[PDB]
Structure formats: C-alpha cells, structure tokens
Design a protein around this nucleic acid. Structure first.
Lengths: 56, 252, 121, 233
RNA sequence: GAUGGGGAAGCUCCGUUUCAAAGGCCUGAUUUUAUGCAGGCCACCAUCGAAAGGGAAUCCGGUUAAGAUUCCGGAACCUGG
RNA sequence: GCUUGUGACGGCCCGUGAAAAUCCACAGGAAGGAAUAGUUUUCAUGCCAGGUCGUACUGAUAACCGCAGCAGGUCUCCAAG
RNA sequence: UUUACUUAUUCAAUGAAGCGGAGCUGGAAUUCAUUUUCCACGUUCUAGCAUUCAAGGUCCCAUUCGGGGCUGAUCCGGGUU
C-alpha cells in the first residue's frame, strides 16, 4: 500500500536502469532506439535540406 | 391548475445532468499563436469511453509553448484516429484525418467535425456520433465560409473558425433496436431524468392541458403558438405543418 | 524616460511592510493567574473498593480530575505534588461528568505508601 | 576555441519552450490603472468642446521657467518667519507703539480660487496662472473668460503641484500677482507680452476650435490604409 | 456555503472561481539582517460534506460482580523528533 | 463438499461500471563534498513522546418507533451433523 | 432609406503572452527609375527527449569562487485578444 513504500528501502522500489520503478525494460529499449534513430534522421533532414536549397 | 413537468424541469433539481463518470468537456485547444501562425503537434494517448455520449473521446497531449509541461486536451475522436497518432493543429497543418485546421485553409467538399461557430468557442457543431459538416464554398473577401450542417441548414462562418477533419466516431448507433425498456433506462440514467414519459392524455387536467375526459383525447389542436406561454406549450410548438412527411422536403 | 520589464502578465500585491503591534494601552489590566494548576487538576482521590484494589495490586492511583485537564497536566501535577515518577496515565469521563484518571507509577514507588501518605486508604 | 560548444535554441513554433520576454503590453493591470488610462483615452477620443481644450495649450517650458522664477521671488510666508515677524511686531507695539508700521508691506503672491476670482473681478490682478490639471474642471473653466472680460493676462501652466510648491501647499490650482516691487516690473511686462501673445490674443480662434476626435494608432493605421489607397498608390 | 462583486425597500438572494493589486515555498544576506535586502521558484484562490467510501500503525494469554484489540504480562509496529 | 478470500480467463452493455487526501518512483543536474577524515540518518542498533472525544448495556414479540412490557415495523456479520 | 467610425453599450475568451504598423531576409511579378506590389519570413516517415535570467559571441568590472550589459530573440506604439 502507498504509505508503506516510505517504510521500505529503495532496492524494493527501484531497479538499476534508467526509469527503474517507472517503466518497463522493453519500453526503455523502445525509447532509446527511437531517440537515437530520430536524432540521426534529424541530421539527415538537415543536410538534405541544405543540398536542395543551395542548388540555386 | 398545477405546474407541469416541462415547466419545473427548468428549476432542474432532479433534472440536472448526471456528470460523475464523464471524463470532461470535449474542447478544442485554445486558439493561440502557434495554432494561428503555424501548427502544434500532439499525441493521442487514450481513446476512451465517455458516459452519456455515444461518441468516443481522444485524450490528446500537447506541449505548452511557454512553460515546460504537458497540457492535456479532450477531443472528440474522428473515425480512424488511433493511439500513438500525431495530431497537427493550426493554420499550416496538413489535410489529414484528426487534424485541426481552419475552414478557410481546407478546400471545398472537405468533411469536418467539432467545428467552431465563431473562433474561440472550442467546438460547437458536428459533435455527436456520425455527424459532420461539409464545406460548400469560400468567400475569401470578408473571410467567410459557407457550410452544410447535419440538419440541412446552410450557415456562414468565419474562415478562422477551426474544425477537425473527418467524421465523429460511434456511427451507426441508432440503427440498432434498443429493444427493451431496461436498455432505455440504462441509457438515460447516465444522462438525465427524462425517462419514462407519461402522456398528458393519460393524466388529469390539473397535471396537463391534454388531461381529462371520459375518453383519452386532447380536445383542442395540439398545434400551439410560439406566443403561447409556459404551461400552454405542451404539443407541437409553432408547427408550420403536421402529419406524415410526404415527398421532397428541404424545399429551396 | 524608462520602463520596467515584466516577464509575467500577472499583477500581484506588492509585498509592502507588515508593521507590528505597539499599543498605547494593554488589552487587559492584569494577567490571569494559571487557570489550571495542580490543585485544580487533581480534585479528590477515588476510594471505591475497585480503586483501592488497583492501588494494592497494579500500583495505580485513581484520581478525580478536571474535565479541562489532559494527561500531560495530570502527570505534571502528580510529579509536582506527590513527588512521584509516572508511567501510563489512562483517563475516562464517567457517566456523571467528572474525569477519572488511572495513574500508574513506576516500579520504584509504591502507590499504597503514597496513598496512606495522602491520607486515604 | 576552447572545448566549450554552441547550442543555439530554435524558439520557433513547436519547439524550444519560449524564453522570458517583456509582457508589459499584455499584463492584467488593476482596475484603477485601467480606469485612469481609459479616462485619458476617452477624453481624447470624444469631441471635446472649445472652452475645455482652451486648455491642452499650456505654456512652453522656457517661458514657464521664467514665470516660476518671478513667482518664487515673491513666495509667501511660512510659519517660521511668520512667528518671527509676530515677535517683531509684539516688540514694536511695546517700544514704538506703531501699529501696522513696524513690518513692511508684503509683496507676496496671491492664491486661492475665490480670492483670485474676486481680484480678477476688481481688476487688481496683474497676472494669473491657472492649472491644466483640476479634474472637477468646472472649478477653472470660467477663468479665461473672466480674465478676458476684465482685461487680465492669464496663462494656463502645467502643474497645480508646481503652484503648490511655490505657494507652500500641495495644490493651489491658481496663482496671481497683483503687486510687485519696483525691480521686476520689466520682467513682468515681458512675461505679459509673451503670455498675451500665446493665450489671450488667441482666445477667439480657440473658442471657435473643437478638440478631440483623435483615433488610436491601430484605427489610424486602418484609416491610412483605407482612405489612402482608394485612389492613392 | 462564505469571500470578491452584483441584485434586492429590506429580512436577504445569486454565485464559488468568478469583470479582485485574493500568497507562500525555499535560497542566499549573514554572524549589524530582527528578518529586511540582491535575487530566482511557482497560480492554483475559502470552509463544510461519509462512525458502511478513501485511510500510518497490535497481537496473544490472563484478568472484573459488571471494562477490555483499551487493564496485567509478554511479544511487535507506525508517525513525529 | 460448505463458507470465504484470491488468481488467471470468459460473457454483457447506444450501461464500459467515483473522486480527493496521501505515499513512492523516475527524468533532470541546482548545490555540496575527497584521506590525515567528509559526506549516508531510504542499511542495522540505540534515545524521547504520541494529545482530545467515544468505549457499560439492549439492539427487539419486555431496553428503538408504534399513547403500552402492542403477534406490527426496523440495516448487517458468523454460521454444525 | 442605406452606409461608414469607435469609445458608450453588448457578447466571448484568456495563468489577459506574441496585436497593429514599419522593416531586414528569400521567391514571383511588373520593372522605366530601381521601383510599382504580392507570398513566405526555423517544427510532418517513427506512442523518444525538450525546463533551472539559454549556450555561444562581444563590451565592461575585472577575471581570484566571479558579477553585469547587449546580442542571440528586428524597431515603434504600451489599444490584452
């Protein structure tokens, strides 16, 4: 119950990843993958826009 | 005589709406700088039931432009929208289902819903299950836009009035026979105390104008003036015709 | 010819000076004496046979007590008057409207010696 | 040139939570602020008559500086020097026994509205200053008409608070010189010439002119796009 | 159901977030600073309303004419510091 | 097997079956901090305190309501062969 | 009779944040004196993140733990829309 999480220590309430006692590991995996890949495609969109606009 | 049912509905003690389980008011996002100069992106997180409403709701989450937080909004779900879908809202948003555009930005023949009467009211028209308005012309001078509403009325609205693209979900609802009084009971015990309905003809003269008689009859024309007053308005009010509808109506 | 800069679009009360009391005359002439002192806290012992049984057995004194009094006050009064250390105080309100305190002393003191010192038994 | 890096923020729509900007134009001001601002606006927007707006034509700053120099020479008494001269007069009534012959005649500036109106009526005033202020404007609207009917030079100056500063009050709404020593008469005459040039000699055209009718900047721009390019280009 | 405001001859009515300048959390300042001052933070805005809804934490054995998850003995737990 | 709790499932709805206090976690990287001893008072142990009011009994063909020690009415738990 | 103005009045919204005008910068366009005008003036394969007067640049004080201004984030009008 909620007010017992205050009595209890932290190894009972969290695991040792980022987003430990908040998100599932597969959810964390998804969002890491998503972050990295979208941040790469951002770079790609930038250079594509540059090579298109600088044509003229 | 005695005060009748329709009169005391307005006092509205036991005729208030039953609003416990309603998720909230279905409102468009407040018309602000982004939504009137560009677009803002939001995510559909939940598609959820709303009690007393056959149409489902979409919990859309947007970012606040001015403070680091997430502002959540409650849209009426257009048919086809789904969880994890991006919703684009504003002047320069693309014409896709679920997007919130101005009715000037959309072209003619476009089908929208939850469309503002005037800019800023956050959705008034075409909000119930299966309903939509059609855009049937622009007047770019004086920034107006002529539209067909689900009643058949043509209206003229500001081009700056927003509307969400597509038709509202829950359609086909009134095709099914409700088929039993218990289902009508459960329908209306989540809306308001408008059910069951007794007939004036079935009650006494104190209780209704149609009441009384050694037979169950009305006695006077059930068509009653618009200039009648409260207590005298308990039939077909300001009826310009009556009877079985034959032939082409919507004459123009 | 210069203007302030306001990052919020909200105007709130300027936190001006909260000046303190400085009266020309006292609100009342004389301070009231202690309204609930020890002799007002403990009124009378209770010498019913059950209470005397509890004295002999549980090392428990039984006092009639002011209804405005609480356990802190009762403990303080007992320690002040009878020169006695105190464990658990229990209290009830009787069906006659007076408060009854069951004061348990520590193991070092003997409630019966204290009682015959107080005079009753 | 160090390791340190540039990370420019795109404060465009749909990204980069906006920064703290100046929003003095959008604040929800208090009601007294809005009352006095909109009162300024409304009095400007409405067609004001001529006898109001014979104000709004207050006196230039250099001429006003000269005027207030002249008057601050003839400031009134204060309590300190009043008690001083009371002591002097109590002494002189004992030793000299000369009543109303010990202290010299004062040449102070005359103030007060009823006083000054009576002075104007009896033509004893030589110069009258009037505030562009008072809010119950009826107190002072009739004074130009009087000074013109009675042949008195009047000047609408800025600041009942200036007048109060020179006359040892907070507000006065008027001030007047009747008598002046034989050292500043030439300065007073120069001032009268300038002042009559500006106020009394323009009184007829000013009585004819109607003020106000001013528009906001937004509406003025709308006019300057509407009536401009109907036939302009 | 107060307040702000508005109605009402008035007893009082509306309305409870409103056409209101409706406050506090911390920080430094420090050993003049009491708590002001150099700052930054926030926006919502009464209160009442359920011994069956939500809810920090206790059990055994024994004991009285009549009290006990309350006393005695023993064995535990929560909160606050 | 009976009573009860619980789990995973299935069916039903134009019905999809409360809120808030309260507690925790995460993200973030403010600030502070190393050995001639500093940080941890979410590990263990140890110290102090825990107020006010209620608490007996009946709860129904005689302890409630029905003029009464009235065949009436009056919410629920446990539950043997 | 019709029409126009905004300030009175009325409606609505907002934690009264981005109005109006004029400019810089790109495109089309006619240019006939270099204009005459108009459109844009940072986000669209993905259920990710976006916060701490923003880093950077520059000028001061002083660079000794640093602090300040401007720009980055066009100017004017302060008529919230």
């Amino acid at each position: 119950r909620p007010r017992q999480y205050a009595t209890v220590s932290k190894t009972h309430k969290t695991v040792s990843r980022a987003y430990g006692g908040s998100r599932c590991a597969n959810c964390v995996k998804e969002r890491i993958i998503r972050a990295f890949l979208i941040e790469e495609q951002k770079i790609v969109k930038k250079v594509v826009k540059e090579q298109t606009e600088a044509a003229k | 005589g005695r005060v009748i049912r329709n009169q005391r509905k307005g006092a509205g003690s036991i005729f208030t709406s039953h609003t416990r389980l309603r998720q909230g008011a279905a409102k468009l996002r407040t018309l602000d700088y982004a939504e009137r100069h560009g677009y803002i992106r939001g995510i559909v997180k939940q598609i959820v039931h709303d009690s007393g409403r056959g149409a489902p709701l979409a919990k859309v989450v947007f970012r606040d432009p001015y403070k680091y937080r997430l502002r959540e909004e409650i849209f009426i779900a257009n048919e086809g929208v789904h969880t994890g879908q991006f919703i684009y809202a504003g002047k320069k948003a693309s014409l896709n289902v679920g997007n919130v555009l101005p009715l000037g930005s959309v072209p003619e023949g476009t089908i929208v819903s939850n469309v503002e009467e005037k800019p800023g009211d956050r959705g008034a028209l075409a909000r119930a299950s299966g309903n939509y308005v059609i855009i049937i012309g622009h007047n770019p001078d004086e920034n107006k836009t002529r539209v067909r509403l689900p009643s058949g009325a043509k209206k003229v609205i500001s081009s700056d009035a927003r509307g969400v693209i597509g038709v509202i979900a829950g359609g086909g609802r009134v095709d099914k026979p409700l088929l039993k009084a218990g289902r009508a009971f459960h329908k209306y015990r989540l809306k308001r105390n408008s059910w069951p309905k007794t007939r004036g003809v079935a009650m006494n003269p104190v209780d209704h104008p149609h009441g009384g008689g050694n037979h169950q009859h009305i006695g006077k024309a059930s068509t009653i003036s618009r200039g009648a007053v409260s207590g005298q308005k308990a039939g077909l009010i300001a009826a310009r015709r009556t009877g079985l509808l034959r032939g082409s109506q919507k004459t123009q | 010819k210069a203007l302030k800069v306001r990052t919020s679009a909200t105007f709130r009360l300027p936190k001006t000076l909260k000046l303190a009391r400085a009266p020309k005359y006292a609100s009342k002439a004389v301070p009231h004496y202690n309204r609930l002192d020890s002799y007002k806290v403990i009124e009378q012992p209770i010498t019913s046979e059950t209470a005397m049984k509890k004295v002999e057995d549980g090392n428990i004194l039984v006092f009639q007590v002011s209804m405005k009094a609480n356990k802190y006050q009762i403990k303080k009064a007992v320690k002040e008057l009878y020169e006695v250390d105190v464990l658990k105080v229990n209290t009830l309100v009787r069906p006659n409207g007076t408060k009854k305190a069951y004061v348990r002393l520590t193991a070092d003191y003997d409630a019966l010696d204290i009682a015959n010192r107080i005079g009753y038994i | 040139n160090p390791l340190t890096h540039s990370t420019p923020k795109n404060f465009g729509i749909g990204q980069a939570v906006q920064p703290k900007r100046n929003l003095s134009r959008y604040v929800k001001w208090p009601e007294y602020v809005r009352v006095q601002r909109q009162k300024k606006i409304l009095s400007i927007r409405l067609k004001v008559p001529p006898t109001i707006a014979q104000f709004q034509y207050t006196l230039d700053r250099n001429t006003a500086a000269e005027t207030f120099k002249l008057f601050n020479k003839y400031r009134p008494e204060t309590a300190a020097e009043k008690k001083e001269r009371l002591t002097k007069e109590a002494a002189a009534v004992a030793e000299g026994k000369s009543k109303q012959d010990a202290s010299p005649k004062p040449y102070a500036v005359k103030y007060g509205l009823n006083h000054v109106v009576a002075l104007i009526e009896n033509k004893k005033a030589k110069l009258v200053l009037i505030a562009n202020d008072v809010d119950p404007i009826e107190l002072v609207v009739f004074l130009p008409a009087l000074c013109k009917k009675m042949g008195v030079p009047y000047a609408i100056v800025k600041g009942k608070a200036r007048l109060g500063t020179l006359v040892n009050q907070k507000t006065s709404a008027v001030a007047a010189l009747t008598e002046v020593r034989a050292e500043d008469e030439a300065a007073l005459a120069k001032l009268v010439s300038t002042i009559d040039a500006n106020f009394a000699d323009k009184y007829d055209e000013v009585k004819k002119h109607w003020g106000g009718g001013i528009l906001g900047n937004k509406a003025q721009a709308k006019m300057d796009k509407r009536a401009k390019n109907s036939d302009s280009a």
